[PDB]
Design a protein around this ligand. Structure first.
Ligand SMILES: [Mg+2]
Ligand SMILES: [Mg+2]
Ligand SMILES: [Mg+2]
Ligand SMILES: [Mg+2]
Ligand SMILES: [Mg+2]
Ligand SMILES: [Mg+2]
Ligand SMILES: [Mg+2]
Ligand SMILES: [Mg+2]
Ligand SMILES: [Mg+2]
Ligand SMILES: [Mg+2]
Ligand SMILES: [Mg+2]
Ligand SMILES: [Mg+2]
Ligand SMILES: [Mg+2]
Ligand SMILES: [Mg+2]
Ligand SMILES: [Mg+2]
Ligand SMILES: [Mg+2]
Ligand SMILES: [Mg+2]
Ligand SMILES: [Mg+2]
Ligand SMILES: [Mg+2]
Ligand SMILES: [Mg+2]
Ligand SMILES: [Mg+2]
Ligand SMILES: [Mg+2]
Ligand SMILES: [Mg+2]
Ligand SMILES: [Mg+2]
Ligand SMILES: [Mg+2]
Ligand SMILES: [Mg+2]
Ligand SMILES: [Mg+2]
Lengths: 172, 136, 197, 191, 106
RNA sequence: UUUGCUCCACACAAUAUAGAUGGAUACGAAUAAGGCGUCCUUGUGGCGUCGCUGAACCAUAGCAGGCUAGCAACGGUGCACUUGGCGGAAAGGCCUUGGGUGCUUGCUGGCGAAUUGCAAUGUCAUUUUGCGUGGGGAUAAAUCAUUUGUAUACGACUUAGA
RNA sequence: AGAACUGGCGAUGCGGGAUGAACCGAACGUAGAGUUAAGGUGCCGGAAUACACGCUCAUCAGACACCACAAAAGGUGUUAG
RNA sequence: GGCCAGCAUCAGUUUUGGUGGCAGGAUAAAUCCAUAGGAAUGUAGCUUGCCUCGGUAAGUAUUAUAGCCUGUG
């Protein structure tokens, strides 16, 4: 659905005479602007509590920045998604440098592999896989092996004008 | 009758491999490959050259034939320390590649007058070379 | 850019070569295309053979003359691809087409002229390595074309003469380089280095 | 999922020197030499020493990787072929009409000529493939023998014979007549 | 010497248009060697002559000129829009056209 | 049929142009590999080097390029001549020999340019044709009518006629 | 074939959906300049052979609402669970 | 002062660039510096088994003749 930010959102049911200071609940929400975020928040709250936006209030919205944005990380990701004939829980692992990048490719991957659009997905958990060997999906362990190296065969350099006088070469 | 098998000897994605960046705020700058993220992304860092430690898509960068001793996942200050230690810059500077780059930057800075002088000289150089190429 | 651009068919992807050639015409650029038999099409030989027979059966039921014409020659399979990318029933369209010429092989004038390529239609830059493709010459000879062998012959003969041309040229630039060197480190030469030359 | 690399080895024995430019393979050993063209494949060969050659695939898919091994096999059978050689044996099989097999020559060519099959007046022919030689196995009844350095030219010249001898229009179960490939192996014995 | 050109070579491409309707009041020029809108921001304003020939001599010559100027950049690859004193004839699509260096800003 | 035709030369007139304005600047082949240089045992060879675009290479100064002088070179180039050779895919063009002659911005001199008035394409290309002159060369045929019948609705076809 | 509410066509061109009464956008005095809608930008054809991550190779692949159809059932093709 | 233009200074509308000053947030998050602790895709060192003279591996071993991680400042 876009380029994401992650938000702490905090809300509560509106106060009353007999119940002033109601409980206060938080969600980390992955959206692109705060307007989508707040909306998403109410979407899940009503999937959980007796509340609607009409009878409750947003208390705080804050963007959370990645703690070590230039550290590579092995993400484990949990998702609930809807297919054309059923709904489904799922676990992928993503390797990137922020939760926020991670969630971007997840959404991509789901749309690509399972034709799932944004409306049809529920991120359940996104958490850092602290020690390798708890990394489980092979397309990731692949990139943890020691002293790793690889070529990129068949170089295609992009021509900047319609004709060329050489004949290219894919060396690299 | 030894055996003899081609080779094909590619530049590698690998920690310590220096690349020249081609898109963006940086671009024309060198940086080192710190970690490797997947077949498409790596984590680069180029402190001497000014470029921010970052994730970057490989296809935005071109692998130079230069490599130097770097621990995987080394932080910027360390990358600065090693780079210097290995004198990669003078090494790059010395290559045909970097020279080819600087040559054409210079051509593109010439004043119209300077341009005029380049011609006068080529006439001069042409005169004596054509002679040479004519006697043996 | 030049008054005429000669394109080496070999290694190009028909419809991409067509698509760029069309535009160039329309923009005023004369073009001749050569070695059109060494043209490529994605998809394995059989697929484009089946496609060709599809084309092969459309004809005017009352009079197969008036109906769609099927040229079997590689240049002309090509031209077809092209023509459809050009508004050929308009004067402006006819005009652009007259700027075009296609040839199997490389006949006189052009064999001593230089030919170029079109990277955005160069198979070896475009097709994912692994994918299967088709050579025009082989495609055409299986739908009727008569002259693959005689082109091959003429080419191999042309290819010999040009290998000499080259060898001579390489010999002479070796000298030229040796001159342009018996003259490096001279004042004028150092001066030009400074100015990027 | 694209495998960042998988590779194979190709061992090299004391008599042979394989050599490979582009992807055009030449193996020369005591029993002659064959060459084979791998250009259709996209692997990368690498000498490690005079008795070892690695073959690898970078960032490959299933069908890709799954062609790595068959490359290894193909060049292996060139190496075994050029040392031990290959020997295909076939027995004739008939239930009443004795199948009669001989080697004829028209315009210098060498053909396997099969007559009488299942009664048949017609005379069957298979050419001898260049590189394969044919001995009518003495000491053994109705056995034919195809040798050579190329598995592929012997195995095919084999199958050509056995297929010239298919039975039409009968219960192919009851009518088991034919020439069948009866044992596959090497030329140099003890091995 | 052999070059006297003080202009940049150029090409009469189309009129401004939709799929199915053209507007002869704006012509679209491809300017030799200009590949991006940024590149073409330079020529904005430069004057354009389409130079052509005729059989009747007139003010002295057998050479006439339609004059115009570059007015905006068009799209993503250095094509440019221009207007002329009188709209250009449309047999001209694909004809060459001259762009000058005046009015100058260097 | 009132001196006709053709090739070459310039001349006058017309006529037109799908669009000159420094140069279309020649291996082949491969792309999970190559080009170039070098050595050698000449090979699927050793060693070196390059790419990461033509952002090149070549040309490029002189009244749109005038008139002139000298020097250093012996080089470059234009033009017409002449020597030997190559190219038949549409060769109709490429290379080579030798004398001649112009230019040379390789370097150094003398003279000129204004008033086209602060811009106005400011005219420098190449197409086809018509008509005189005179330098080479050449000197028919088809059709109607007649006729044959291997042909035919008419035309057409096919024969024949000093 | 027959009702309910609204909005339309009929009475209405204009841009898009190649084409089309009713769909999408938008409703019309004569015009300049700008910006957009719906819908597009390989070439036809104005406009990125643009960036990015996956997926798919079809000996009748597939390719955009209305819309110009396909189903049960199967696959040790391949992908992710 | 008829016809058509060029430039300059402005006005209306618009389009495309350069550049200066500030505000907010975890008073951004990082990098960097300091500091405590840690582990491994284990850096030096050590051990042991082959092994063309020290190379390989499989142990040990947490800064050593690389470094990284995590928290607090
Ligand atoms: Mg965080
Ligand atoms: Mg049966
Ligand atoms: Mg029966
Ligand atoms: Mg015309
Ligand atoms: Mg090399
Ligand atoms: Mg060589
Ligand atoms: Mg070599
Ligand atoms: Mg060059
Ligand atoms: Mg001069
Ligand atoms: Mg021609
Ligand atoms: Mg002078
Ligand atoms: Mg005459
Ligand atoms: Mg009515
Ligand atoms: Mg309406
Ligand atoms: Mg319309
Ligand atoms: Mg439709
Ligand atoms: Mg079309
Ligand atoms: Mg367009
Ligand atoms: Mg763009
Ligand atoms: Mg639908
Ligand atoms: Mg199904
Ligand atoms: Mg399946
Ligand atoms: Mg006026
Ligand atoms: Mg203003
Ligand atoms: Mg600012
Ligand atoms: Mg280290
Ligand atoms: Mg720390």
């Amino acid at each position: 659905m876009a380029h994401f930010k992650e938000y702490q959102v905090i809300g509560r049911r509106l106060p009353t005479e007999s119940v002033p200071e109601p409980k206060l609940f938080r969600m980390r929400i992955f959206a692109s602007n705060e307007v989508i975020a707040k909306s998403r928040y109410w979407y899940f709250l009503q999937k959980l509590h007796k509340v609607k936006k009409a009878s409750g209030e947003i208390v705080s919205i804050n963007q959370i920045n990645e703690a070590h944005p230039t550290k590579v990380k092995n993400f484990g990701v949990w998702v609930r998604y809807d297919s054309r004939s059923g709904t489904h829980n799922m676990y992928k692992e993503i390797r990137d440098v922020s939760r926020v990048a991670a969630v971007e490719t997840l959404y991509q991957d789901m749309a690509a592999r399972h034709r799932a659009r944004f409306r049809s997905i529920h991120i359940l958990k996104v958490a850092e896989i602290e020690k390798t060997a708890d990394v489980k999906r092979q397309y990731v362990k692949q990139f943890l092996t020691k002293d790793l190296k690889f070529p990129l065969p068949h170089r295609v350099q992009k021509s900047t004008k319609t004709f060329s006088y050489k004949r290219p070469s894919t060396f690299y | 009758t030894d055996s003899i098998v081609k080779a094909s000897n590619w530049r590698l994605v690998e920690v310590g491999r220096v690349v020249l960046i081609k898109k963006g705020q940086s671009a024309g700058k060198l940086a080192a490959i710190v970690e490797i993220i997947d077949q498409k992304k790596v984590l680069i860092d180029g402190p001497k050259a000014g470029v921010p430690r970052q994730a970057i898509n490989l296809g935005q960068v071109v692998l130079t034939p230069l490599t130097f001793a770097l621990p995987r996942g080394a932080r910027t200050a360390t990358v600065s320390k090693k780079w210097a230690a290995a004198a990669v810059c003078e090494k790059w500077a010395a290559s045909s590649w970097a020279k080819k780059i600087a040559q054409r930057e210079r051509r593109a800075a010439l004043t119209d007058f300077e341009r005029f002088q380049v011609m006068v000289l080529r006439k001069q150089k042409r005169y004596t070379v054509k002679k040479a190429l004519a006697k043996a | 850019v030049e008054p005429v651009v000669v394109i080496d068919g070999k290694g190009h992807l028909v419809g991409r070569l067509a698509s760029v050639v069309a535009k160039q015409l329309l923009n005023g650029q004369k073009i001749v295309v050569v070695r059109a038999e060494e043209l490529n099409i994605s998809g394995e030989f059989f697929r484009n053979k089946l496609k060709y027979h599809d084309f092969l059966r459309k004809a005017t039921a009352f009079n197969k003359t008036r109906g769609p014409f099927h040229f079997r020659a590689p240049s002309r399979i090509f031209y077809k691809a092209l023509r459809g990318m050009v508004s050929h029933k308009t004067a402006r369209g006819k005009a652009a087409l007259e700027r075009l010429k296609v040839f199997e092989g490389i006949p006189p004038p052009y064999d001593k002229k230089k030919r170029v390529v079109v990277p955005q239609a160069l198979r070896v830059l475009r097709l994912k390595p692994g994918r299967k493709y088709t050579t025009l010459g082989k495609l055409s000879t299986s739908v009727g074309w008569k002259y693959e062998d005689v082109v091959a012959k003429l080419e191999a003969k042309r290819k010999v003469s040009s290998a000499e041309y080259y060898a001579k040229k390489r010999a002479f630039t070796k000298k030229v380089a040796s001159a342009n060197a018996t003259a490096a480190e001279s004042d004028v030469a150092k001066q030009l280095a400074a100015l990027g030359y | 999922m694209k495998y960042i690399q998988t590779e194979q080895q190709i061992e090299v024995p004391e008599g042979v020197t394989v050599s490979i430019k582009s992807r055009i393979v030449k193996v020369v050993g005591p029993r002659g030499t064959l060459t084979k063209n791998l250009k259709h494949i996209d692997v990368t060969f690498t000498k490690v020493n005079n008795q070892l050659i690695k073959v690898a695939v970078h960032n490959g898919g299933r069908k890709h990787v799954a062609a790595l091994r068959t490359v290894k096999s193909l060049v292996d059978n060139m190496i075994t072929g050029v040392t031990k050689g290959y020997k295909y044996k076939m027995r004739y099989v008939y239930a009443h009409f004795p199948i009669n097999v001989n080697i004829v020559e028209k315009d210098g060519a060498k053909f396997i000529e099969v007559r009488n099959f299942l009664g048949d007046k017609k005379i069957r022919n298979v050419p001898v493939r260049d590189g394969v030689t044919i001995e009518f196995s003495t000491n053994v009844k109705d056995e034919i023998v195809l040798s050579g350095n190329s598995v592929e030219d012997v195995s095919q010249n084999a199958a050509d014979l056995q297929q010239i001898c298919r039975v039409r229009n009968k219960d192919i179960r009851k009518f088991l007549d034919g020439i069948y490939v009866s044992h596959k192996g090497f030329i140099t014995e003890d091995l | 010497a052999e070059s006297h050109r003080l202009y940049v070579k150029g090409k009469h491409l189309s009129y401004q248009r939709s799929k199915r309707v053209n507007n002869p009041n704006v012509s679209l020029i491809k300017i030799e060697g200009v590949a991006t809108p940024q590149d073409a921001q330079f020529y904005l304003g430069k004057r354009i002559a389409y130079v052509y020939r005729a059989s009747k001599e007139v003010r002295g010559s057998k050479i006439r000129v339609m004059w115009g100027k570059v007015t905006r950049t068009h799209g993503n690859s250095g094509v440019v829009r221009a207007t002329f004193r009188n709209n250009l004839p449309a047999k001209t699509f694909g004809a060459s056209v001259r762009i000058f260096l005046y009015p100058s800003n260097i």
